[PDB]
Ligand binder design. Sequence first.
Ligand SMILES: Nc1ncnc2c1ncn2[C@@H]1O[C@H](COP(=O)(O)OP(=O)(O)NP(=O)(O)O)[C@@H](O)[C@H]1O
Ligand SMILES: [Mg+2]
Ligand SMILES: [Mg+2]
Lengths: 8, 325, 1521
Amino acid sequence: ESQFEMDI
Amino acid sequence: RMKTVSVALVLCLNVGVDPPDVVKTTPCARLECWIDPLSMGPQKALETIGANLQKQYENWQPRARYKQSLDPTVDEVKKLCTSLRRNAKEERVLFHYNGHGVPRPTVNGEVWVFNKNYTQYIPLSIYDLQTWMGSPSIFVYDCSNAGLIVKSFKQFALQREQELEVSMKNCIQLAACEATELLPMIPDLPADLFTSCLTTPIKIALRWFCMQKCVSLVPGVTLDLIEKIPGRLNDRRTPLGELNWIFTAITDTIAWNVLPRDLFQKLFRQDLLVASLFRNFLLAERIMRSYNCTPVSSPRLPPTYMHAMWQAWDLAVDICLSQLP
Amino acid sequence: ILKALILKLKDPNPGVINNVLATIGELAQVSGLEMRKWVDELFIIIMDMLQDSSLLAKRQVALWTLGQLVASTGYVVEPYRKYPTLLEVLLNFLKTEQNQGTRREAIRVLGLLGALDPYKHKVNIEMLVNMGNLPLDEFYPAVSMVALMRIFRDQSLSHHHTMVVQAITFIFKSLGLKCVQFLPQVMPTFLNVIRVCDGAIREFLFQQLGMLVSFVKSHIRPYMDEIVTLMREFWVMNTSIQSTIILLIEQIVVALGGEFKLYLPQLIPHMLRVFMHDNSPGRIVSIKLLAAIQLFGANLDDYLHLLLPPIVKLFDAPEAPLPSRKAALETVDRLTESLDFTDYASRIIHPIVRTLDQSPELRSTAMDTLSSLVFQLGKKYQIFIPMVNKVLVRHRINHQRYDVLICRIVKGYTLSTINLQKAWGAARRVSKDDWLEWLRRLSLELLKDSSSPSLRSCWALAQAYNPMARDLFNAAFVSCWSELNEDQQDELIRSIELALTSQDIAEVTQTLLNLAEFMEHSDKGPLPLRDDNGIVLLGERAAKCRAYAKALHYKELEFQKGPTPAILESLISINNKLQQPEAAAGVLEYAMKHFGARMAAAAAWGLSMEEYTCMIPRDTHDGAFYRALALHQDLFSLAQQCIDKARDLLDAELTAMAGESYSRAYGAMVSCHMLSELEEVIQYKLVPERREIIRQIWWERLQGCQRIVEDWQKILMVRSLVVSPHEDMRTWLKYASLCGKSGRLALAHKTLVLLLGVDPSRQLDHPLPTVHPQVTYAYMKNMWKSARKIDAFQHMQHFVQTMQQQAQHAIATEDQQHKQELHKLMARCFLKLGEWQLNLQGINESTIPKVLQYYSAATEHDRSWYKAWHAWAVMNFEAVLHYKHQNQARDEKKKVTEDLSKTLLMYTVPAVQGFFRSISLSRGNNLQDTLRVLTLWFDYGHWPDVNEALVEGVKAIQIDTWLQVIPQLIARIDTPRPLVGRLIHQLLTDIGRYHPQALIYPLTVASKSTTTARHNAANKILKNMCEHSNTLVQQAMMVSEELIRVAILWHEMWHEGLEEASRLYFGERNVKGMFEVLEPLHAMMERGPQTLKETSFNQAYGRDLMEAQEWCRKYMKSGNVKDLTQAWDLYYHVFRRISKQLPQLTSLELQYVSPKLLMCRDLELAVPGTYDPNQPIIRIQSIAPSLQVITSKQRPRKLTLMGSNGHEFVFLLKGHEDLRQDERVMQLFGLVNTLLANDPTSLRKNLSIQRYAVIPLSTNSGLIGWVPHCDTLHALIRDYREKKKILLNIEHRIMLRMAPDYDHLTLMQKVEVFEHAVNNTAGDDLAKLLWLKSPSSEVWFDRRTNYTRSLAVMSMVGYILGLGDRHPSNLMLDRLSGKILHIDFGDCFEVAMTREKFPEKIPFRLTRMLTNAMEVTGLDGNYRITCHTVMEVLREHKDSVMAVLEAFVYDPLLNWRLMDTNTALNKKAIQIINRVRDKLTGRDFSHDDTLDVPTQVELLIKQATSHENLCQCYIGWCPFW
Ligand SMILES: Nc1ncnc2c1ncn2[C@@H]1O[C@H](COP(=O)(O)OP(=O)(O)NP(=O)(O)O)[C@@H](O)[C@H]1O
Ligand SMILES: [Mg+2]
Ligand SMILES: [Mg+2]
């Protein structure tokens, strides 16, 4: 529930 | 942090009816949600536009529910606001008003919300709307004089403040333009440019660059190629994914290097939806200033169109576009 | 001599032209007919000289020379054909030169050339437009703009420029934003006017253009590159122009938004020059330019690096005037509100700082410019603070704004009665000039105080420009009229009546008549002149002005109030004046059903003459003619003077007649002819060898005149004084032949007696005279056309015997031509005997050999006369049919067919050879022969002797002939008769390599047939074509397949499929059929999506359809009918989902249905239906991106196609209909139009059938050509009744109110109800629509005439064809010509009258609404007469009609549909043909009787209009219109 999520 | 509840999508298009305030002979039968409404009978054009708006919102965040009212009337608005409050109380309610098929707004929020058949119905005052929805909320006004609405809203907030002394000021607004100016009637742009900038920033950014640049530095690249770009908006390995990553990084960098930290966290860190809307808002500002339009937000921000980082974006775009053919 | 004169004339000096022309004339008088080589040029030289009458050295000489050339050199009615303007030029001289010295010579030349047939002559050669379509609030401005533009486009604008332009801009201001609608009309002309005006005008025009731009704002985009170009072309640094252009620029910048950025780069090269070379006082021009720059705003984001340098220079330079340095500083300051100047800060700041030291005067503002820059820069200015403080310290500079700004930055903080009053002066007017000034003054007064500003603005213009004041008169009058009270209108009308009755002023009369016309077309109705609208008075005036169309209209209106003998006499006179004898006859019939020394001299001449001549006034044309009687008295000097006087009087008559077309001019052209003939009759005696040449000229002139026997009689009358009937029997025999009716009966016999010198009308048993065989032959022909047919036959037999004897006596070299003429004459006599034997004897065994011998002799005596070969071939064909029919009738009902074969082959062979030679000897009209050859070929080609004759014949025929029968050759490629098959394949193969465009459409379609043989044959032929060219075949196949696919979408197929399946599931319970109707659709939906709509359909409905398939299979395995119910629940759900859709699908996007077609460019394929192998082939260039669907019971769609000639074609694409029948019908109509065109009576009446293109693509779809602007009768009536608030169902509701059970009533009851309901309403809506939509009486008259004739023609053709059901949807009307069109030929034959449900009884749709739209008289008149003419033509040319109809009927591909409708086809086809023959021969009403045309037509009319027949019709087909 973050303002921005990613998977790098 | 805070969360949101369902989105209140309120549309007033009246497809096939030209408001008395405008005279149109220029072939600007522009797109609405990338749909040309005159290629279909009114019922399918309206339903189809509804569906695309719904999808555009889903693309940014999964929703508990959206609800949509493509038709009048006032009782439907009352019931919708009541239901929205029942599923509240603290989570923000999002409103979206168009008014493209409606006479220009005034101090009383005049709008064609009726069960007729050509009736000049109602001064649907902002005050009553504030009463119906008193919870924290976000409003988007994609209309010809949206700043007038924001001004009136604040004046009614002052009225309420005076009455209380004998969730106001916890809500935010995004306005398509200043109270004293009109939205452009320019061929090849969408009729809902502000909405498209807030919801589909890449389609607009690329189409805009293609038509706007005085001199193109990549011969052979035109709209027929950009509208065929392969990829996905959630896969970093594809052209579109790379462009969305770069866009997000640049927008956030500008916000970091311009705003006070208090506003920065309140707008770009305390909520996913608000952060997305403001990130796209900065793009809308940069594009719309070239048409003599000035978007207006409830909190005032320093100007950003002047920031050097925008040049980096332009370069990156040309590089990506140079690989398409 | 002549050569030198021509060279001197072509390149002469008026003195040389004059002398050379006179010399040429006198030379021509001597040279004669050995001059023509040079005249065939000299004529045009003189005529060109004559046309430039103002540049010619005494035109009289050139015209005289022309006349002398025509007369002396032997020219006849021919130079006009070569140079189709001479007669018009001579008439123009006659009318407009006004110099009798040349007008009378032009008259002599006109008469000399000779009168020309009007149908050789024609061969060689806006307020009411929309008043009734607009509200008045829209209308007034629209008219004014047109009037202004008429002036504006003309060159008179060069003197009046200024007021016209002002009026236009005023109108735009008054209109507001709606004025945008006028931009397509103003702008393209206005800008071009700028290009050619004086500078004094150009400045004005630029200022007004700027105002127009301000008024229209953003609606100027499409015109923004011509204005920019003109600005650049005229910005020549002239101070005045510079000021005007700068203002114009500011107005454009305000009018446009950010779009101005697209034009700014083209102006920058000029603005920079202003800042370097400004020679104006104070550089005032530069100052104005600076102000404009302040308005650009964001538009300068990409150009500051170009404009800032000179701006800085304007305030940095110490020598510049202070006002300009101040202005430059203010400009720089103001620009900082919108543009980013960060990157230019060092270039801005340094110039500021020096200025601070230079003078405090500029410092006073420099500190504010600096402060604004510092504000924008913020912390970035701290680099510069340590510099600038040194200046602020050296000079006592204190600025609170700056100081606060700097401190905060350093600390880190952010920041109308006249129209009547003068009109009544009519009471005081006396002379014609007084009335003209009265009218002019009134017009000006009406404009002056008009209530609308769009007319008041034109008053100043109206003070001059007379025609303009005239043009706006009616609009202003109507405007003023609508605001007056009863007394004002009363007095105005009284003034009008005074003007109308005071005196005959042509201008005032025509103006008032046109005004009345407008009022009759307005919402105010007719003017209340006296009582009943002044109909009588206006009529009288119309007659006086020769406005016969109006006189007729008004008289018919009088008729509507009740017949009176005086009215009928008026109608007969007016109809006579309009040259409509048929209408006059109708009037006479009405009357006879409802109610109970000039010529003395003419007689004496034909047979006292001196007395009659003296009695006739000397000052009349006819008097002078009868005195010129010098012709009988040989008083040639007197005849000369009488002719000159007659010519002067004729000149006056010609002037009076001038302009009333050539129809009226002809009578005086005949007078000119006769006067020239009189000069010839005089001079015949007085000239050398030319005398005999005159006779030849006379003969040749006679050929070009009309065939009116009265005029021939007058010409012969004057020619008889010098040439006897015995010297030129050719003319008298032609005259007798031209005469008809009792004219022929009296005159031909008198003429033949005259020419022979023998009276064979007495002693009728006497042998024929041997005097002039041509004359005796004509006598025998006259005997045949009477009750003496037998006598004529026997006399012809003895004549032939005599001619054979003469041919024996004619054997000489000198008489060889005579012998040849005798051979031709005998050929004619033998054919007449062949005709006449059978007309009297019939077809018998004893007559066939004799006719065959006569025809053979005819073809032996002459070989080039194709008619003899035709008759022979036909007789042999008839003999073949005769013997077969005789066996079918008596020997039959197969050894008898062997006995037949023994002689049928004998007759068949020469029949084939005959037809092939007949085709070889003719062109164009060879259709019938070709069809007969095809008939014999198809039935008898299997015989080796017919095959051999056939092969040689086919090899001998030019292949182009076969193109006209391509649709039939392809139909029978299934024939199981190898010799026939092989020949057909060879023929088609040969055709394909010369004219492939003619086959590619019939083929390709042919290859899609289910039948294996058709498929294989089509493939073989197409492969042979591919060897010649692959590309055409590949493209045609691709286009045909894609075009067929887009005709019908999956949604429609499933809609109809499921509807039929529902009918079977719940109605019939035919579960087997309920699979059979769906199975092929499921199999169809096995191929998978191929395009976008197919994919969307499959995604939407696939699952449900597949589950339904599984439920049906499960049922077939189990037998438990619940499984089908579940399948039907799925089918129902899908059905309803589709049913709710379709009305919203108003158009199709090509990229969603056939992407392949969208990409086609420059195809090697003719546009469908346009192939003509004499013309260039139009190639298909492109297909419109989208199609428009038409909503109806069916869903046709409109296709637009762009061709290589730049023109667009429009077609209707539709499926669910077999179009192969319409093609054949169109072919028949083509034939009929040819037959009508060949008949001179039908020709003069312009009778024809309107056709359109039909192009089948498959068994159930194809293209129909789009017909230009026309309307459906139904729609016209509907719209009319809605406009007038008339309930559409009045007749029906009335019938139901009297009889709610109307459709069970006994016939007599139904008739009583029908007649009552008919008698309760004024069913004449069509007549009113026809009048209301016509712009003038003349157009209305012509429209009505064309309407009536069109109906009569289609009534008779439809009757013979047997055309079935007709209702308002099927009939169309042409908005311009008034002709009609029939658009549905399904019920080809009488099957409509055999239908079990509501059979038809009525031969054609002639009803009340149609009948009362014709002339007031009714059906009698034009309609009946036209029907007679058409029926006579159809009854003459029966063989061609039967050949086509028989080919149509005996054609299994279509006959199968006729069989399904009727039936064995082997007999029904025979009954159909017999019925057609009965109709053409006049036995349809009674087998044992024959009817003439009048009786046949009267019976048909009585049948069509009977109430008993109408009451039995289904309301489809509403009988009450
Ligand atoms: N050649 C034509 N040119 C112009 N308009 C046509 C033509 N043919 C038909 N129409 C018009 O288009 C409508 C009828 O067209 P169409 O659908 O093909 O016939 P239909 O009566 O509906 N079906 P059917 O009679 O069974 O062949 C009408 O509105 C006509 O005015
Ligand atoms: Mg049509
Ligand atoms: Mg019709």
